[PDB]
Amino acid sequence: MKKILDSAKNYLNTHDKLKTACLIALELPSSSGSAATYIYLTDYFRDVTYNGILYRSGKVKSISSHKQNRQLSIGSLSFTITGTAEDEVLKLVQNGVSFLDRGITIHQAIINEEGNILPVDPDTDGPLLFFRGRITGGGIKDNVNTSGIGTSVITWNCS
Amino acid sequence: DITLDQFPLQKVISEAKILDIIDESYQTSWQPYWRYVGWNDPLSENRQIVQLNTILDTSESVFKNVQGILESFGGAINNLSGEYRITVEKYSTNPLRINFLDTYGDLDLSDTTGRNKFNSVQASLVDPALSWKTNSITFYNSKFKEQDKGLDKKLQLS
Amino acid sequence: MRLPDPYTNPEYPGLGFESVNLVDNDPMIRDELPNGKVKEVKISAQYWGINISYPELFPDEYAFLDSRLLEYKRTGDYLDVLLPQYEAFRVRGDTKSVTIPAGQKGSQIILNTNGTLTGQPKAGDLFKLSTHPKVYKITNFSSSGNVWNISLYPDLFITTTGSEKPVFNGILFRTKLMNGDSFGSTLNNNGTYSGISLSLRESL
Amino acid sequence: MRLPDPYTNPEYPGLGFESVNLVDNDPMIRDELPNGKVKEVKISAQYWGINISYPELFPDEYAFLDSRLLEYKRTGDYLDVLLPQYEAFRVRGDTKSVTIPAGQKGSQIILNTNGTLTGQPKAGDLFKLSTHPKVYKITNFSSSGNVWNISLYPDLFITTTGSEKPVFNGILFRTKLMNGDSFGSTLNNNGTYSGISLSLRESL
Amino acid sequence: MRLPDPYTNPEYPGLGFESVNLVDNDPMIRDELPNGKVKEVKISAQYWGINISYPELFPDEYAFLDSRLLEYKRTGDYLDVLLPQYEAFRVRGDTKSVTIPAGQKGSQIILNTNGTLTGQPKAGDLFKLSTHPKVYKITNFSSSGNVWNISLYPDLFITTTGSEKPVFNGILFRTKLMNGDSFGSTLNNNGTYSGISLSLRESL
Amino acid sequence: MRLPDPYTNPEYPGLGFESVNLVDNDPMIRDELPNGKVKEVKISAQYWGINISYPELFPDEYAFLDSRLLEYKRTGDYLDVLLPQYEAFRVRGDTKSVTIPAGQKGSQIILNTNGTLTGQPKAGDLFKLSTHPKVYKITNFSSSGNVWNISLYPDLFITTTGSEKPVFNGILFRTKLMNGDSFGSTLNNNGTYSGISLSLRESL
Amino acid sequence: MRLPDPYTNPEYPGLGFESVNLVDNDPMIRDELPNGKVKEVKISAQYWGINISYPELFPDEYAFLDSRLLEYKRTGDYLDVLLPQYEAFRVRGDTKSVTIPAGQKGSQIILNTNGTLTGQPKAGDLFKLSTHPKVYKITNFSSSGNVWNISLYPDLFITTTGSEKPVFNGILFRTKLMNGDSFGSTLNNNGTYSGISLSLRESL
């Protein structure tokens, strides 16, 4: 029971072609201890900006499904950030960092014609939260087949 | 029965010498029960990494007792080249320099970092300084926990 | 890089296209309810897929094609394709004085022209913003003398910064080879290279 | 949108279809019983599938067609298609005074007219209710002068509000493209876009 | 082995190819980002794939071909194939006086000559360094009289030792058969071994 | 058992082969490293796969062919095939006095001939050792008057005992039906049995 | 049931087969050993597979064929097909005086006649034992006047009881349809059931 607002109810009932966008506010794996530095990724295509930060839109190919039944079950997701982005893979495989903590918040923003249609009644009328969890993640899978296309995806696990 | 001919003696001796590299951390002066730890004759060095004293109750199983010893000193038995070749964890300046271009195309990375890394450890000994009664060793780390985010997470051991 | 065209250099004929396919590649997730409705959600992006097919090439034309494609491949630059299909040269004039408001988004660019643009585009003519590479097709139009509304099918990949300018003419699709993996050309007995087809895709 | 046709704007000939395929898509549950009987139970909907194909299109006609299909795609509104094969202009007259009882249901509409309709619809003529999108085909007819019963193939998805009014001609299928994922436009050497086909489905 | 050709020995005509296909095998990593951009990072190697085909071969010619291919297969040595399409005999002269600086890398070789080479190589002409097997194609050229820079398609697998010397003609593709698993030889009724094709790949 | 040939018995024509395919069936494991190299390891063996096709057969010829093939099946003996392709009848003379050294191995046989063999074989001629069934193809040759070495493509399945003797003439591939599972022959209206094709493989 | 033939009742011409295919189904175990040898062991059975096809059948003759095939299906008895290609009426005479010793086994039957058989069977002529169903083909023959040896392709499934007698003429394959799952009969516009084919297998 998230009240979802009557405006969002009407939009979901009528519009029938809604451009879903996810707002991933990652917290960077940081070493030696400092203030938290956040990378703001989104799936969409343009650059969807919610309440300040711009949420860059050049990564995160897909997001897993949030499967959680009536049993506390370490509810887990998994990003898929392209492994051809030097910055992300570098932050992944740098030796010295530890990221036991570091929140991941995903906002599943229902894009309006021009910029988010104001659901979530208690919160400032923005998108529903989607995960709001912690990052306990894996890493690269490279293929570089000699025949042709190979894939490379960062599988950021989070639970 | 392993016939003692399936072992290569030279690397077995090498790994045994890897085990008994002197631990310049403590001193023999502060070992009260020097004898019942299991080294004879004070003055001699006796400060060796992994100085395990074993009970092998022969009622459990061969498999489980052997894996218990291996978990104790840290290692594995590996009949890869046809010989058992008991290896142990080590650091050395002569490794193999494997470049990615050499291997093949597939390369999996898997950080099991959420569950399998810790900031403080707790241990459990059968201490001769307690008349063979359980004793607990614990640390904390200011570097590690500050690296994490100030999250308390203890490794537990016996 | 301007993939070679007869306009660029006509001394090598036959490098002109014989069939261009604009694949309106619009990855989108479709569900078919038993209610009768179909529900679709737009994620990812839209890339115009260009399917180039070439005729038989004599050694000189194919040598030039290899020169240009290899200079494309060894470099990081992007292939540029001009489609003669849409080079209508309407609007015309200059685009320096026309201005766009602060931030538009949402598939409509409401730009006003003072006196520098003389001509109404037809619905279906390619349109581009100066700063952002990708090419938009106009799908409706309406004018109020100086201010005219323009509606685009791809939903404005870039936002508006306030200095964006239209182009309307000489627009080039930034494209990359999707056939770079296995790009071969059989040289038959006749001495002509055959079966050289290019599958292109934008790198906006 | 009233997908453009020669009826809408005839200045572009060749926008008329060269083949129309009403796929009578009838989802159901079928069990081929070991007895031998086949039992059919109908759930979900009976959505008319239209698979339109086009003749050779010159660039201007296909420019207009792209305009309309892309303004479809950028917006959410449904494609509306008027099939010329069923626009026989029977019945005719006005439909304002045509009345329908409170709640009919059950695939048989008994609509009474005073004198405002002059013409008997024939079995196989498309039928629609003004309020609800879906299009029905008439499968039988019988008249009592002012009151005639009309039997539809789909079983009246919407129940009758009591203000429904038939149309009988110029009825538009609310439809959505099922080919928008990868939509291709090959330009033949002769200068005409060839083999442009559209696959459509209702969204009642 | 210098896979036999009419150039090597012409007493057996028909050993010449009837179709040569340099498959520019360029393995890499490509992700079609949801942004719309395509980012490609190149690892592995850029190995030229040759798919050779032959005319109908009389039993003596194919007997000689079997000899050479089987002395290939029993040995570990590589096939060397000299492509006639790129053997224009440009450049010419001797290559002993040609010098190359210590370490070039980065797909651009600036090789300087005193006067020993008389002729400009053309874009699309095969190029090879004497020490290292793999064959490069030239994609651009410019000269300063004694010092001319040469741009190569592959990114110079071997770094320059400082004693490298170009060849520019008669360069042999060090390659290995990819069809030796099951090699077929059908002798038609007419008496000719027909449809004998070889698929090759370098072993740089 | 010597599957019937026109040389064996010419009174039944059409039992002669219309297309013979020696398949160099060489099972081998190939890895393609990103380094650029390809790595190949030889295990298993080599079996010359013979792909035989027959024309339409009149009842007499097909009755004889069934007689011989059923004699092959009910017995354990191996099919023997003589290929007219390689029956060159070079070398000639007798082979009794020629000696082979004690243990040779390794794909090269160095056999010395005193005066009993008069004629140098051409590279590509089938060669067999007297005691071991499988036939080898020569792929190079060199002679020193009395001692000439022979290089074979298959790597000498048998070792050398010291009494091995060459044959050079009339060597028959030991073969077994790989089509024995479903060996059918359609008797057409024309009265001729058609579609009788044999796929043979050695049982060395 | 004796699937009808023109021999049985000729008033329906066209029930004769247009194509007969004896698939010599020979199940076995084959391992292609790494040595190169192919070793096969024979288990299961050697069941003759008949693949009958018919000319275009008029409604009456195919009505009769349906009668006989459906009377086959409703009962459990096996179809009996007599192949006309092997009914050469050799051997001839009566088969009562022919005797066979106690137990022969092993694919060679040595049957002795006094004088009652007048004619030598030929290799490839079908052979059957009266007591046991399956049909054998003769693969070799030799005679000593009263005692002649006959060699069979299948290895004598039944051992000899000591009272079995050959037939040599009009021998019927006990067979079962493998097209009874879905049997199709298309009535051409011309009035003929066309392309009626049957796939049969022995049920020895």
Side-chain angles (χ1 to χ4, degrees), chain G residues 62-130:
Chain G
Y62 191 76
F64 193 77
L65 195 44
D66 284 335
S67 178
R68 279 232 183 183
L69 286 187
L70 300 195
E71 211 284 334
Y72 159 76
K73 286 190 187 174
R74 76 164 187 88
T75 303
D77 43 359
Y78 309 104
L79 270 187
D80 313 277
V81 164
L82 171 54
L83 283 197
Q85 42 175 50
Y86 291 120
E87 199 174 8
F89 285 164
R90 282 191 288 250
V91 185
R92 204 161 51 270
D94 193 334
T95 71
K96 69 175 294 296
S97 299
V98 64
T99 55
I100 296 172
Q104 275 283 29
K105 188 173 42 63
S107 87
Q108 282 186 27
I109 296 175
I110 297 169
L111 73 170
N112 44 4
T113 63
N114 302 18
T116 306
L117 303 202
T118 45
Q120 272 207 5
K122 207 158 306 302
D125 183 338
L126 294 174
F127 172 77
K128 188 178 94 132
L129 282 156
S130 62

Side-chain angles (χ1 to χ4, degrees), chain C residues 29-40, chain D residues 25 27 44 47 176-179 181 201-203:
Chain C
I29 302 276
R30 178 166 297 107
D31 308 313
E32 276 151 45
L33 267 58
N35 203 347
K37 311 213 303 178
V38 298
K39 287 187 177 292
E40 54 206 349
Chain D
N25 263 343
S44 49
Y47 63 95
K176 303 206 75 180
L177 269 174
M178 326 285 300
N179 267 334
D181 292 78
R201 164 204 206 290
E202 306 186 67
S203 287

Side-chain angles (χ1 to χ4, degrees), chain E residues 158-204:
Chain E
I158 190 167
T159 306
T160 303
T161 313
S163 76
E164 291 305 8
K165 292 172 185 185
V167 183
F168 275 124
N169 55 335
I171 62 170
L172 284 72
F173 291 76
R174 171 177 161 180
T175 61
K176 298 204 72 180
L177 285 179
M178 311 264 298
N179 267 335
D181 293 330
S182 58
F183 199 34
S185 310
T186 50
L187 189 151
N188 296 115
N189 218 356
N190 306 343
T192 57
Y193 283 134
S194 50
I196 304 305
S197 74
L198 297 173
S199 176
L200 278 66
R201 167 194 198 298
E202 302 178 51
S203 278
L204 61 87

Side-chain angles (χ1 to χ4, degrees), chain C residues 88-109:
Chain C
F89 262 81
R90 277 182 283 272
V91 176
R92 184 201 311 310
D94 200 329
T95 73
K96 63 186 293 293
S97 301
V98 65
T99 187
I100 297 172
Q104 273 284 30
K105 317 192 267 196
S107 86
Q108 286 193 12
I109 305 189

